[PDB]
């Protein structure tokens, strides 16, 4: 409706609270496996952030899986940095991790992260 | 980390996408029953927004329930307005619904909504 009021902080508060659920392992429903490193998460958060997880969890068979194995070329630290970004809006982009973060964001289909990586890399050359 | 960059729109985008999942009935895992009106939702979103649902879904028995029946004194339109607020940050507060919205927000333990209702009511008198 056009008569709505809006609580500016609501979306950020929701995200902070979803990250608290993740930290306390509350109602996490999938394990993402990256070269034997395991990450517990919520399928809905993964889907809301990534084109790859959205395609995975809308599949009629894959939606029922409790474990998803990522391509072995995917770097676990790169995945971890992206999983933290999904739950917090914060991206720990560093010189020593930028290539793995960009490669993982391209695989996960996270266009905004890909864009900032391309900008940081182009500025370095 | 202190070296993090932040994507300002991320939290709002996540919330918009969780509401798209709700609209398309994707991975909804609970039905909230309010005087025979039914509302499909995601337990994690309900918990991230409401002190009542956080207490419910952290309970070792209630966490497994796929249906939660609310007190019969709860108004379904009031609940619907609050469920939309949870997923969008927007509250459709109107003269004809403010009392039911405030009563439902007090029951759901949604303090920010209670606060704005108290302000709108005090301004009317």
């Amino acid at each position: 409706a056009d008569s709505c009021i809006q609580f500016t902080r609501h979306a950020s508060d929701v995200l902070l609270n979803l990250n608290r659920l993740r930290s306390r392992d509350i109602l996490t429903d999938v394990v993402i496996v990256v070269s034997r490193e395991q990450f517990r998460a919520h399928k809905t958060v993964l889907m809301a952030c990534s084109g790859l997880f959205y395609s995975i969890f809308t599949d009629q068979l894959k939606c029922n899986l409790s474990v998803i194995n990522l391509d072995p070329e995917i770097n676990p630290e790169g995945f971890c940095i992206l999983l933290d970004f999904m739950y917090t809006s914060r991206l720990n982009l560093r010189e020593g991790n930028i290539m793995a973060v960009m490669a993982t964001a391209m695989y996960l289909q996270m266009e905004h992260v890909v864009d900032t990586c391309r900008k940081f890399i182009k500025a370095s050359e | 980390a202190d070296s993090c960059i932040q994507f300002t729109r991320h939290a709002s985008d996540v919330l918009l996408n969780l509401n798209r999942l709700r609209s398309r009935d994707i991975l909804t895992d609970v039905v909230i029953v309010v005087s025979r009106e039914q509302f499909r939702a995601h337990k994690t979103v309900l918990m991230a927004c409401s002190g009542l649902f956080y207490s419910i879904f952290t309970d070792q028995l209630k966490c497994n329930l796929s249906v939660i029946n609310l007190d019969p004194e709860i108004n379904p339109e009031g609940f619907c307005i609050l469920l939309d607020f949870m997923y969008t940050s927007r509250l459709n507060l109107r003269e004809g619904n403010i009392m039911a919205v405030m009563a439902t927000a007090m029951y759901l333990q949604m303090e920010h909504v209670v606060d704005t209702c108290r302000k709108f009511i005090k301004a009317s008198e």
Binding site: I5, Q6, F7, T8 | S89, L91, H112, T116
Partner: peptide, 5 residues
């Protein structure tokens, strides 16, 4: 917070 969106 609350605003007119």
């Amino acid at each position: 917070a609350w605003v007119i969106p």
